[PDB]
Amino acid sequence: MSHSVKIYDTCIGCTQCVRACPTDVLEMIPWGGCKAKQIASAPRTEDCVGCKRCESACPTDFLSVRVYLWHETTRSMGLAY
Amino acid sequence: DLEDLGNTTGQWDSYGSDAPSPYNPLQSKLFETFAAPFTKRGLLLKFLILGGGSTLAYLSATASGDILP
Amino acid sequence: ELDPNTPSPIFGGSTGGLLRKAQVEEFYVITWDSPKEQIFEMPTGGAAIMREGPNLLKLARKEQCLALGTRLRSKYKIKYQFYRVFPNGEVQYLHPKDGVYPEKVNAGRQGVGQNFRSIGKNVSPIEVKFTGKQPYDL
Amino acid sequence: MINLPSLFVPLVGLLFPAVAMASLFLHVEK
Amino acid sequence: FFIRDYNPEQNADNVLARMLEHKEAIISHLSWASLFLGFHTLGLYVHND
Amino acid sequence: ALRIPRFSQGIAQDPTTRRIWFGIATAHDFESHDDITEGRLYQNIFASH
Amino acid sequence: KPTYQVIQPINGDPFIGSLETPVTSSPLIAWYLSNLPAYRTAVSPLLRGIEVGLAHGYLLVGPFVKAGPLRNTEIAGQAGSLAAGGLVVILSLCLTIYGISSFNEGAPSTAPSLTLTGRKKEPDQLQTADGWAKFTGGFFFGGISGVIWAYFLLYVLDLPY
Ligand code: CLA
Ligand code: CLA
Numbered sequence A: 001m002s003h004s005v006k007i008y009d010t011c012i013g014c015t016q017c018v019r020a021c022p023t024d025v026l027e028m029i030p031w032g033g034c035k036a037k038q039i040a041s042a043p044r045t046e047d048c049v050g051c052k053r054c055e056s057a058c059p060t061d062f063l064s065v066r067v068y069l070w071h072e073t074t075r076s077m078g079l080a081y
Numbered sequence B: 001d002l003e004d005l006g007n008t009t010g011q012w013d014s015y016g017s018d019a020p021s022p023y024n025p026l027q028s029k030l031f032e033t034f035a036a037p038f039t040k041r042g043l044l045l046k047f048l049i050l051g052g053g054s055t056l057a058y059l060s061a062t063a064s065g066d067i068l069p
Numbered sequence C: 001e002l003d004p005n006t007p008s009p010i011f012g013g014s015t016g017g018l019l020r021k022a023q024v025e026e027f028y029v030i031t032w033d034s035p036k037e038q039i040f041e042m043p044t045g046g047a048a049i050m051r052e053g054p055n056l057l058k059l060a061r062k063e064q065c066l067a068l069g070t071r072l073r074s075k076y077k078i079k080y081q082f083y084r085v086f087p088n089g090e091v092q093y094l095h096p097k098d099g100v101y102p103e104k105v106n107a108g109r110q111g112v113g114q115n116f117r118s119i120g121k122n123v124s125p126i127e128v129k130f131t132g133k134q135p136y137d138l
Numbered sequence D: 001m002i003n004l005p006s007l008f009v010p011l012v013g014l015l016f017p018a019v020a021m022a023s024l025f026l027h028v029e030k
Numbered sequence E: 001f002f003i004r005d006y007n008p009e010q011n012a013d014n015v016l017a018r019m020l021e022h023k024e025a026i027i028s029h030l031s032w033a034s035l036f037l038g039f040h041t042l043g044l045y046v047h048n049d
Numbered sequence F: 001a002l003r004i005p006r007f008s009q010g011i012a013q014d015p016t017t018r019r020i021w022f023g024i025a026t027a028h029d030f031e032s033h034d035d036i037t038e039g040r041l042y043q044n045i046f047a048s049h
Numbered sequence G: 001k002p003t004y005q006v007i008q009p010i011n012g013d014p015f016i017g018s019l020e021t022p023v024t025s026s027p028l029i030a031w032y033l034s035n036l037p038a039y040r041t042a043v044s045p046l047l048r049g050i051e052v053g054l055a056h057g058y059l060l061v062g063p064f065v066k067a068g069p070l071r072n073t074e075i076a077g078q079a080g081s082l083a084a085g086g087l088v089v090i091l092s093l094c095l096t097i098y099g100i101s102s103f104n105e106g107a108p109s110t111a112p113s114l115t116l117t118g119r120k121k122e123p124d125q126l127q128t129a130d131g132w133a134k135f136t137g138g139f140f141f142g143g144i145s146g147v148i149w150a151y152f153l154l155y156v157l158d159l160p161y
């Protein structure tokens, strides 16, 4: 919000789990351990569109994720052009 | 190797651009103002919009005798 | 565009790729390593042979470079770069910045994750109706 | 003069629209 | 009301709540009316046709 | 890339048409668009109707 | 010689595309369109306005004088200016409130020429508003006007056949 769809989970481990998504996600931040201990819902998100390819794979274990920014770019659209 | 239409031929060569037409019919400023009302404008265009459209619509309908629908 | 051909990467023509508002906004070219010359899929309906380098073709929008990337690491190599061009050079510098290959640590950047509170019971509604006294703007 | 009350359909159904379709292209700009 | 306004701690044990709480039933003993009111009107009207 | 019809900012920007279509069809949803305070809103429905 | 120019797709880089081909770009097409706005701006517009206004002018006659609402007219008017003259007005301002997309506002003044322009970067705008006026001002006196040596003329006319 301006991109706020929660995929968070608890493991935030990313091996045989999830990577897919055009740019948006650099993660691998760590947080002071969780087993695999790469955590967070996100990296800085003012770059790309609105997939839910974001889960589809590797847990979010509450909500899926989805469309919702509303507040919508063009670059975040696909079309201006 | 005689034949080749030895540099055949070129043009100068295969350029085109640099003067293909004299530009335009004379008319210089056979108009210039001539009719101003779009040649004046700052500011207009309402003015005109109520006028043109007031006749068109005003006489556009009313009268003389029917001729009805 | 003859007087300078810089080119590394080899299409021929297409209807495809960028049309005007790449000039008027933000530009988006991707560049890469190669071994021995191979014939490739594209974004935009297809295809070409590479050879070498810069190996620096430019794309429309960022989804497209990364999109090869998947494309580009099946059939392999390490090295793919994608940069974002303006008209007017820089800010927003896109793949360069720290490391690459997200799935590493040096640092955090980013992200949080939670807003103010964690996933648990927002059965609880939204609260006070927007006033500029209380921390609802991040 | 005889038989002539035809102006409150263009001023409205025609010209009033002209105004706003013009004018209200203030949504684009002003 | 349930999303923009409405206040689960402010409401609770409390009859409007309880409506959420014992809700899975509410749609069922509703959907049981329809499905019944369904095929039974539709037996009588095709059969009749 | 202009700044344009206001209450929203979110809306106020996308070039893509959504800016008009949407422009009309928030107008009415007072609570929680840009302007709004519980004192605004109320009155902003009162001198409305 | 080269199978079609020194064989290029576009101006040169493939990547924008447009698959430049005949009907895009043949010495023969391309030329049938440069006093006119397609490439270069001949003159500061003001004049292009009426050859544009006028040519498009005496059109829209048999369209709405031979296909008119209750057609083949017995009236003094049509053959006719009539309604069509009304269209060039609606048209011509539907045309103006587009010259509020660009204002960009100046007089520089050059229909006079220095030095082969290049425009430089004409592509894209660099038409101020005080340009798009003198065009859609030429448009009115091109539309209305170009609507009369249409009807002024007797139609000597050719019969279906
Ligand atoms: C609310 C609306 C409404 C109204 C009031 C009208 C009204 C009209 N429509 Mg119409 N129409 C509408 C909605 C409407 N329409 C819609 C939604 C559609 C789409 C389905 C149409 C599709 C349609 C068609 C296809 C046609 C019409 C036509 C007409 C006209 C029929 C009679 C006529 O000749 O006009 C009376 C007046 C005029 C046409 C303009 C008169 C201007 C003259 C007096 C000027 C000439 C003198 C001189 C040059 C000017 C002097 C200026 C000086 C001061 C400098 C009439 C004006 C027909 C028509 O107009 O053909 C002739 C026909 O074309 N309509
Ligand atoms: C066969 C037809 C059919 C019918 C009967 C309808 C009927 C309707 N459609 Mg619709 N529609 C259709 C086919 C149809 N549609 C198709 C094929 C598409 C696309 C595939 C659409 C896409 C569509 C959309 C997106 C919407 C509608 C809406 C509507 C409703 C709005 C009615 C209204 O009064 O607006 C009146 C319309 C106008 C006033 C705008 C027209 C502007 C013109 C006249 C300007 C002319 C420009 C001129 C040259 C400039 C001169 C300048 C001058 C102004 C100064 C109406 C129920 C709307 C809706 O749902 O609203 C409730 C809207 O959402 N339709």
Ligand code: CLA
Binding pocket: E031, E034, E035, E036, E037, E038, E039, E040, E042
């Ligand atoms: C004419 C309609 C068609 C039919 C038959 C139905 C039927 C139904 N809709 Mg429905 N619906 C329709 C069009 C239809 N809808 C349309 C166009 C829309 C909007 C786009 C909706 C939107 C809608 C909603 C929102 C809901 C329903 C619901 C329902 C169910 C409500 C329970 C009921 O009425 O009795 C039961 C059904 C009938 C009387 C229909 C006949 C079903 C049986 C008898 C099949 C016959 C067996 C046959 C011999 C074997 C053939 C199969 C094969 C082996 C050859 C019912 C199944 C609701 C629901 O889910 O209820 C729990 C609710 O969710 N509908």
Ligand code: CLA
Binding pocket: G018, G019, G020, G021, G022, G023, G024, G025, G029
């Ligand atoms: C009204 C139009 C419609 C539109 C918007 C387009 C648009 C386009 N067409 Mg196209 N086309 C159309 C109808 C249309 N076409 C039809 C009906 C055909 C016949 C099948 C074609 C066959 C065609 C081909 C083969 C090509 C295109 C191409 C194109 C694209 C670029 C070419 C260009 O603009 O060069 C500029 C065009 C001109 C300067 C046109 C000049 C011709 C005038 C002067 C004729 C005047 C008529 C004369 C008085 C007498 C003829 C009488 C009558 C029989 C017509 C562009 C997207 C090209 C493409 O795919 O993209 C690169 C491709 O080459 N078209």
Ligand code: CLA
Binding pocket: G060, G063, G064, G065, G067, G068, G069, G070, G071
């Ligand atoms: C979409 C099409 C369809 C078509 C083909 C027509 C056609 C017609 N309608 Mg009509 N009508 C329609 C849908 C249509 N209508 C619908 C949907 C409605 C209800 C919404 C109506 C309601 C209606 C009414 C009330 C009337 C008509 C009338 C007419 C006639 C007069 C048109 C006129 O003079 O305008 C002027 C025409 C022009 C300015 C045409 C110029 C441009 C054309 C040639 C297209 C450009 C192509 C061009 C040649 C490009 C080729 C390449 C080039 C470079 C060479 C004409 C027969 C009138 C009539 O009385 O019928 C006999 C009557 O007023 N219509």
Ligand SMILES: CCCCCCCCCCCCO[C@H]1O[C@H](CO)[C@@H](O[C@H]2O[C@H](CO)[C@@H](O)[C@H](O)[C@H]2O)[C@H](O)[C@H]1O
Binding pocket: B033, G107, G109
């Ligand atoms: C009906 C009156 C026609 C006679 C022309 C004088 C009025 C024209 C309107 C402009 C009003 C000011 O008078 C004007 O005279 C000439 C216009 O023709 C200009 O002389 C020249 O420079 C102008 C200023 O940018 C430009 O429009 C042109 O390049 C050119 O006309 C004077 O710079 C200007 O001051």
Ligand code: SF4
Binding pocket: A007, A008, A009, A010, A011, A012, A013, A014, A017, A018, A040, A041, A054, A055, A057, A058, A059, A060
């Ligand atoms: S998708 Fe979920 S589980 Fe997987 S890494 Fe991301 S946050 Fe963790």
Ligand code: SF4
Binding pocket: A003, A020, A021, A022, A023, A024, A025, A048, A049, A050, A051, A052, A053, A054, A055
């Ligand atoms: S699709 Fe979703 S998760 Fe993936 S990059 Fe886009 S916003 Fe992020």
